[PDB]
Design a protein around this ligand. Structure first.
Ligand SMILES: Cc1ncc(COP(=O)(O)O)c(CN)c1O
Ligand SMILES: Cc1ncc(COP(=O)(O)O)c(CN)c1O
Lengths: 449, 452
């Protein structure tokens, strides 16, 4: 059977390999709209849009035709040694012109992980170029997600991404997760929470030596780490501290990018003025692996100078700007703009968040959080103590399993279940997502008993 | 114009960004078979198959239809949390069953760089799982190429990949480039050279502490480093040293994989029995970004053990095993098998090397090297000293420029002019590749004026 071949031959990411050898896979055969189907023909709402990525859903014919047209023209070429091609150029133009702050240049990669890894190298290269060889350290946040390379997983602030991998590397620093529900002191306002986080950052910088700190990287809101909306005034006050010590602000838009948070970019939603932006996922609705780094004039000018001094920029991937990946992403962004999906997603997000808010007084519901068309419901064993049932993750695992039984694919992030549907979700589809959440919660409530 | 937008908006890899603002791009518009065409309609033989990658050439309709059929079925899904899909499973099966040594599991990534970076993490994870927490250092070679992440560029042994990037990281060690022509002692045999490299490796291991050395990684034949064929008995003697100290052997097959070297794998051509193999490029003819790690039973078993103890394996990329990329790769490997392209490439490789060897006593030709359908001509200013004409790289750059003028895209690696055509290259086309090399060499010879 296909399931036995999978057990025999594939090591799965983010999977217990031994449990996999026992249970085998859930094989997804096909998709259309917001739905995927297993090999038994059971349909599921992809409430996660795959990996917070499939913006236009699973059967957008314009993307499929854009791939075909590029395949039949030039199915592969590269950008090395002055070589170029139309889809990379037209995508780079569109990305610079739609950027929420003035940007200079695009550098393409296959993945968000490769992109953040590349940003680390580019910042090191830049500060070497500027004669600041000590200005190399990165500050990220607890529960931040920035990818899985040796360097990008050091940026990542999830313990499950570091345990057993001897990470983080030296020079990769973490300050606090900006999650009021978990980290605010008794009675502390959002603004006062934001103050204390800005202080933590300033004190980390002073303790490490400001001359040693190159960059601060953050997702506008934290996706994979639990759909963590920062408190009011966090980004304003954090940026003041960064500008104070000449620290680059990197906006990781891998999940927030292209209409997830109620505006085109999380940088717009949260008032971020980044030096560097990292884009992926909704860039192509994940129909092709592609990510993009936007760098502003000063970062480009320094890198360009050093690329001349050292002969050439000694960096690039075979797939960097792949013509099929760039052609699909270009068409994807045109569809998001032509179909006004940023504003449609904002409207569907209000319906999603209002539907979930009906459960705010459920005895297992600790917090309902969200922004735009991304949300999470964090379950707890006790609302007063905020303590888990048995152990962190026990409720989330059971909930995600029940959701699947009820025909919905969600992702458990500890004891939070996430919602990140395709931007094309309609009103009754949002209603069905909340209904399947409600069934899963009912089952979880009877289970905890 | 398209060229002005390119200059305005794109930072190019492996490009002098200032020179790019001055000269602008060469824009490639379309391709078919072994040919690409610029936006002025000038045709070029892609003698490099893009980046040593486009095995089936630029218009294979079977790959384009395999992509369409997968797009119209399931255009994205992932492999996280037990999720799977048919193309990843059937590709994983094909890869394990064609492996040159017994392999256990496939792990998919988007790129060779991500794959080698992932191998680093998996080896660290494995030795932690086995209770050998000191056994973490990697040994690679000077002029090796393994990618551009912070970790994979530390494995890479080219200075241009490290200079200005604060690389390599600690724990990433380099031993000698196995290039007889450049690094042998005057009058040393290939076998004696192989002995001395094996001694250097043993002495590095002993000097560092054998208990601290996890892995040795090598391309069977070095691609980006200049098509460097190792000396006879190198891989035998290096592996003996590795097995002596319980050091994993990683075969980087990103270029050698799928018929480039005269057999399906460089591991077969060079008698390597690796613990881990890394595959990309010809896997999909670069029609889709995909790479694959093959791990043997012992590597899998230790990772699997720790993945249970820690709840799950905390690693993976969004695109890992992308259904369109895996579907295209699966069809690509079927075509290579059905069209006997490993055998055809071996035949075309003999014709290519014979054609170039007409120039073996040229005053600027220092060495003609390769095997299967990968070759390089290393030009020198002086055959006795092996010294370059003007700065190292001058002849390579001039040759690559002339080749382009004569309708051929080749890559210079210093003064080595490389050949890595699509596997589908025919006998006449090999003839035209060598003809355009000959015109470039004639131009370069008139430019230098060797006299003598
Ligand atoms: C915010 C964020 N940043 C970076 C990454 C890394 O992406 P990739 O999986 O494409 O390597 C992810 C992926 N979940 C992400 O969510
Ligand atoms: C031998 C080898 N290893 C690894 C890589 C890295 O591949 P990628 O560009 O897909 O990251 C390359 C790419 N030229 C390679 O040639």
């Amino acid at each position: 059977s296909l399931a036995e071949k999978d057990i025999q031959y594939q090591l799965h990411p983010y999977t217990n390999a031994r449990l996999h050898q026992e249970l085998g896979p859930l094989i997804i055969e096909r998709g259309q709209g917001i739905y995927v189907y297993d090999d038994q023909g059971k349909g599921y709402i992809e409430a996660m849009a795959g990996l917070m990525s499939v913006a236009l859903g699973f059967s957008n014919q314009r993307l499929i035709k854009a791939a075909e047209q590029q395949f039949n023209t030039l199915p592969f070429y590269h950008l090395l040694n002055h070589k170029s091609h139309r889809p990379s150029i037209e995508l780079a133009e569109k990305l610079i012109e739609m950027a929420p702050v003035p940007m200079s240049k695009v550098f393409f990669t296959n993945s968000g992980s490769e992109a953040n890894d590349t940003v680390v190298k580019f910042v090191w290269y830049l500060n070497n170029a500027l004669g600041k060889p000590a200005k190399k350290k990165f500050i990220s946040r607890v529960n931040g997600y920035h990818g899985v390379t040796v360097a990008s997983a050091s940026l990542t602030g999830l313990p499950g991404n570091q345990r057993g991998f001897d990470l983080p590397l030296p020079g990769f620093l973490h300050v606090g997760c900006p999650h009021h529900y978990r980290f605010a002191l008794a009675g502390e306002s959002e603004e006062h929470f934001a103050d204390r986080l800005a202080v933590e950052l300033e004190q980390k910088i002073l303790a490490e030596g400001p001359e040693t700190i190159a960059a601060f990287i953050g997702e506008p809101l934290m996706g994979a780490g639990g759909v963590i909306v920062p408190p009011r005034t966090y980004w304003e006050k954090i940026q003041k501290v960064c500008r104070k010590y000449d620290i680059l602000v990197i906006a990781d838009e891998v999940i927030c990018g292209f209409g997830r948070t109620g505006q085109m970019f999380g940088s717009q939603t949260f008032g971020i003025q980044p030096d560097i932006m990292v884009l992926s996922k909704q860039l192509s609705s994940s129909y092709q692996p592609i990510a993009a780094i936007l760098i502003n004039a000063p970062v480009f000018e320094g890198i360009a100078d050093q690329s001349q001094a050292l002969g050439a920029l000694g960096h690039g991937f075979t797939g960097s700007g792949h013509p099929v990946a760039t052609a699909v992403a270009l068409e994807n962004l045109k569809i998001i703009e032509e179909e006004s999906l940023v504003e449609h997603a904002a409207q569907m997000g209000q319906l999603l968040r209002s539907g979930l808010q009906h459960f705010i007084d459920h005895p297992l519901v600790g917090e309902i959080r969200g922004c735009g068309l991304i949300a999470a419901v964090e379950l707890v064993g006790d609302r007063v103590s905020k303590a888990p049932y048995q152990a962190l993750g026990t409720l989330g695992r059971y909930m995600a399993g029940r959701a699947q039984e009820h025909g919905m694919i969600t992702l458990a992030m500890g004891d939070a279940v996430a919602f990140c549907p395709p931007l094309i979700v309609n009103e009754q589809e949002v209603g069905m997502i909340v209904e399947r959440f409600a069934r899963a919660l009912d089952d979880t409530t009877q289970w905890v008993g």
